[PDB]
Each structure stands twice: as structure tokens, then as C-alpha cells.
Amino acid sequence: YFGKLESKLSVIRNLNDQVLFIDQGNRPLFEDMTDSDCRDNAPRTIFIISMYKDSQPRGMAVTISVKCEKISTLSCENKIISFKEMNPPDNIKDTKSDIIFFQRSVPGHDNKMQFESSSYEGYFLACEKERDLFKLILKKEDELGDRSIMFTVQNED
Amino acid sequence: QCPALEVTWPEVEVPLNGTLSLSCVACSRFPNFSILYWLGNGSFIEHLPGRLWEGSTSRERGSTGTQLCKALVLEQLTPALHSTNFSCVLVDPEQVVQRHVVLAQLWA
Numbered sequence: 001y002f003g004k005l006e007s008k009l010s011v012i013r014n015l016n017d018q019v020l021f022i023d024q025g026n027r028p029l030f031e032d033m034t035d036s037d038c039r040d041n042a043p044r045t046i047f048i049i050s051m052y053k054d055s056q057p058r059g060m061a062v063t064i065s066v067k068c069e070k071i072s073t074l075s076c077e078n079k080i081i082s083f084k085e086m087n088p089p090d091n092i093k094d095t096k097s098d099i100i101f102f103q104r105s106v107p108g109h110d111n112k113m114q115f116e117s118s119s120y121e122g123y124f125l126a127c128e129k130e131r132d133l134f135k136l137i138l139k140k141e142d143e144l145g146d147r148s149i150m151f152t153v154q155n156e157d
Numbered sequence: 158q159c160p161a162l163e164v165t166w167p168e169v170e171v172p173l174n175g176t177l178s179l180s181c182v183a184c185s186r187f188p189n190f191s192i193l194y195w196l197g198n199g200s201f202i203e204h205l206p207g208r209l210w211e212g213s214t215s216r217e218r219g220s221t222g223t224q225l226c227k228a229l230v231l232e233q234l235t236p237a238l239h240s241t242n243f244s245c246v247l248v249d250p251e252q253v254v255q256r257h258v259v260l261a262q263l264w265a
């Protein structure tokens with residue numbers, strides 16, 4: 001079971017330096033952005049990564065949430081990545097959860113992170129293009145050094 | 158140097174219903190995404206029966222990495238706590254590290 005500790009405000013970027021954001025349909029997508037003007041760093045791009053302590057320690061367990069009119073939390077329920085309108089809870093009685101990911105260092109890329117589902121062991125958050133979209137999806141790990149599941153987390157607090 | 162984890166305990170045996178503290182000192186290369194917490198028989202400290210508690214994790218940014226410190230305070234050393242497998246847990250994105258202490262073993 002998990003208990004929530006501290007949280008870090010974070011901009012999450014994919015391999016092409018695009019920024020994660022929650023779109024008008026609660027889809028997690030990525031967008032281009034310059035590092036110069038903070039009016040660009042909109043509320044929908046400012047993520048709250050909350051760290052949890054675990055009774056069975058297996059990794060840096062986190063939730064990823066964002067504060068708009070209401071707070072939304074990233075989920076991988078049924079292996080699809082969505083945002084649920086809910087606050088990350090202080091306690092989680094299970095050993096796994098559709099909102100708990102393990103944040104892992106990329107072994108040969110020192111400042112990059114991968115996010116592994118606790119619910120689906122071996123499945124990771126990944127960026128995939130479809131039409132003109134750059135989507136956040138869940139992918140089973142199938143390739144060593146796969147850059148599609150690597151992210152930079154920039155602290156903004 | 159870093160990462161690192163060490164637990165220290167009182168050298169002198171503590172009598173029944175005595176008081177004591179366990180010191181947990183870690184180092185992590187991750188200044189932000191690192192935590193330190195205690196477990197006793199695999200349970201959060203705040204879930205255990207008895208008179209005990211852990212203080213805040215203090216954090217200091219050095220030149221080797223980031224030092225994390227957390228104290229576990231045992232207000233009344235009962236047989237149950239004397240036989241408890243206390244575990245300091247360091248967690249960051251690169252690894253999990255644990256150090257375990259059972260007072261009854263250390264003083265045996």
C-alpha cells in the first residue's frame with residue numbers, strides 16, 4: 001500500500017522537446033514550446049508529480065496530476081492513457097494502481113525518465129504520433145534504448 | 158559516497174520501557190525525486206501500535222549528492238518494538254535501498 005509524501009511541479013517533455021499537456025478532451029498530448037516566455041507555460045502544461053512511500057518498496061512510485069478548474073490525474077485503466085477528474089489520494093490500499101507509475105532513471109541517459117505502469121508490469125508511458133497529434137500512450141517495452149518512452153522532467157518550483 | 162544508506166542505533170542496551178532513537182542517513186544523486194521513510198514489520202510507522210514516530214526528512218545539498226536524514230523515535234521500548242524489524246528505505250528513480258535493524262538481534 002502507498003502513502004503520499006511531497007509533490008513537485010514539473011514540465012514533462014518528450015524526446016523532441018515538446019511539452020506534455022491536457023487537451024480539451026482530457027487527452028494527454030505534446031506541443032511545441034519555446035523556453036523564453038512563461039505566459040506560454042500554461043496551466044494545462046504544469047504537472048504535479050506526487051511521490052508515494054510504499055509498504056513493498058519497488059521504485060519511485062508517483063501520480064501525475066494537473067490543477068485546472070478541477071484537479072485531474074493520469075490513469076492507465078484498461079491500458080489506455082486518460083485523465084480522470086480526481087485528486088491523488090493520501091493513501092492507496094493496494095500494491096498496484098492504475099494511477100501509480102514507477103518513475104525510473106534511463107540507465108545510459110542521466111537526466112531522462114521512464115514511467116512504468118504499476119498495474120501492467122513492463123508497460124511504459126510513450127509518445128506516438130497519429131495524424132497531427134503527438135499522443136501519450138501505454139506501450140509494452142519491446143526495444144532496448146527505445147527513445148519513445150524517455151522523458152525529461154523539468155522542475156518548476 | 159552517493160548513493161548511500163546507513164542506520165545507527167544506541168550502543169548501550171535500553172531497558173524495558175526505556176526510550177531510544179534510530180538514525181537513518183542516506184545520500185541520493187536526485188535532489189528532488191528522492192524520499193526516505195521507515196517501516197516496521199513492513200508497515201508505515203504511523204500504522205504501528207505503540208508509542209513511536211518518525212521525524213521529518215531533512216535534506217541538504219552537498220558536493221557528492223543530496224543528504225537525507227530521518228529519525229525514528231521509540232518513546233517506550235516494549236517487547237514488541239524490541240523484536241520489530243525496523244527498515245529505513247531510501248527511494249529514488251535509480252534504485253531502492255534498505256537497511257534493517259532488530260534491536261533484539263543487535264543487543265543479543
Ligand SMILES: *[C@@H]1O[C@H](CO)[C@@H](O)[C@H](O)[C@H]1NC(C)=O
Nearest residue numbers: 172173174175233234235236
Ligand atoms: C512497562 O510498561 C508496561 C505497560 O505500561 C507495564 O505492563 C510494565 O509493568 C512496565 N514495566 C515496569 C518495570 O514498570
Ligand SMILES: *[C@@H]1O[C@H](CO)[C@@H](O)[C@H](O)[C@H]1NC(C)=O
Nearest residue numbers: 198205206237238240241242
Ligand atoms: C514485529 O514483528 C515481530 C515478529 O512477528 C513481532 O514480535 C512484533 O510484535 C512486531 N511489531 C509490532 C509493532 O507489531
Ligand SMILES: *[C@@H]1O[C@H](CO)[C@@H](O)[C@H](O)[C@H]1NC(C)=O
Nearest residue numbers: 242243244255257258259262
Ligand atoms: C527484515 O526485513 C527484510 C525485508 O525486506 C528482510 O530482508 C530481512 O531479512 C528481515 N530481517 C529479519 C531478521 O527478519
